[PDB]
Amino acid sequence: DTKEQRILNHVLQHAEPGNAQSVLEAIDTYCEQKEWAMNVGDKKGKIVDAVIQEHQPSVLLELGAYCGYSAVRMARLLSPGARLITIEINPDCAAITQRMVDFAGVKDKVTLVVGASQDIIPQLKKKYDVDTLDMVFLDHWKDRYLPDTLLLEECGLLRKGTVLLADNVICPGAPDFLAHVRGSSCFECTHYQSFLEYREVVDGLEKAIYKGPG
Ligand SMILES: [Cl-]
Ligand SMILES: [Mg+2]
Ligand code: NA
């Protein structure tokens, strides 16, 4: 069933008929529990970990670094002398990440590069001693997923068996990326369901009161 059906199905089984507060409470509970099920279940981090241990990459490319969570997560799993190359376009996110990576005890494995992926990626062979990449983690700006994927290919950085692992492909979403790698026979795809984590996004309501043409 769809997630809407499941929410309704939960309400029918568990809320008091005719009591709106009981319905709301029921739904808030259903969601509060799934979210606790996802956070305690450690889904997102368990997935990344699993992919890395499954494929044992030695040259690993990360597009995007917020607070350095993903860098630490991935670098701690690499064998000695493996390299994580991290590209982040925001100097302030880059600075926190380096601090995070230093503090986490994995700086020996990380090469952090500040700048735009589209400019750095073509420099990887020439300037960073990369032959081909064993794995790519995409967690940067969603409009860059497909362009950078194509660019990696054009630049000769992908080989057969190179693993692309793309985060946040539903929310905020990277549908043009998904359409391309899924429909293309050059890529073999698996989707892993998850939910967002606090570090990734924030939301809010706007209240806008109309004042008249006046
Ligand atoms: Cl991060
Ligand atoms: Mg993310
Ligand atoms: Na495909």
3-state helix/strand/coil string of 59-82: EEEEECCCCCHHHHHHHCCCCCCC
CA distance 22 to 19: 5
* Nearest by Cα to 159 from 179, 178, 132, 139: 132
115 is in an annotated binding site: yes
Give me the torsion for CA of 8, 14, 16, 22, rounded to 10°.
Answer: -80
Q: How far is the CA of 178 from the centre of ligand 3 (A)?
A: 9
**68 C-alpha vs ligand 3 centroid, how far in Å?**
30
Give the distance (Å) from ligand 1 centre to CA of residue 70. Answer: 4
Domains, the chain: 1-214 (3.40.50.150)
| Residue 167 annotated as lining a ligand binding site | yes
| Residue 117 among known ligand-binding residues | yes
- Give DSSP secondary structure letters for 132-180: SEEEEEE-S-GGGHHHHHHHHHHTT-EEEEEEEEES-IIIII-HHHHHH
CB-based contact 94:114 (threshold 8 Å)? yes
CA of 37 to the centre of ligand 2 (A): 19
Structure tokens at 1: 């069933």
Cα of 166 to ligand 3 centre, how many Å? 14
Closest CA to 59 of 31, 87, 78, 45: 78
Amino acid identity of 199? Answer: R
Does 107 count as an annotated binding residue? no
168 annotated to bind ligand: yes
158's tokens: 């992908």
Distance of CA 117 to the CA centre of its chain: 16
Beta-bridge mates of residue 158: 133
How many C-beta neighbours within 10 Å does residue 205 have? 4
142 a catalytic residue: yes
- Evaluate whether 70 touches 96 at the Cβ level (below 8 Å): no
Q: Which ligand is nearest to the CA of 141?
A: 2
Count Cα atoms within 13 angstroms, Cβ side, for 44: 18
Closest ligand relative to 69 C-alpha = 1
The verdict on whether 46 is a catalytic residue reads no
Tell me which H or E stretch contains 194: none
Compute, in angstroms, the gap from residue 187 CA to the centroid of ligand 3: 4
Q: Which residues contact 15 (CB under 8 A, 6 or more apart)?
A: 22, 23, 25, 26
The neighbour count for residue 135, using CB atoms within 10 Å, is 21
Alpha-helical segments (H) within 16-75: 20-40, 43-55, 69-75
Which residues lie at CB < 5 A from ion ligand 2? 139, 167-168, 200
Task: Determine whether the annotation assigns residue 39 to a binding site.
Answer: no
Tokens of 172: 């905020």
Catalytic residue among 28, 102, 131, 197: 197
Give resolution in angstroms.
2.2
| β-pair type (59-63, 110-114) | unpaired
Longest CA–CA span in the chain (Å) reads 69
Answer for the pair 97, 67: CB distance below 8 angstroms, yes or no.
Answer: yes
Burial of 75 (0-12, 13-18, 19+ CB in 10 A): buried
Q: Identify the bridge partners of residue 84 per DSSP, sorted by sequence position.
A: 60, 110
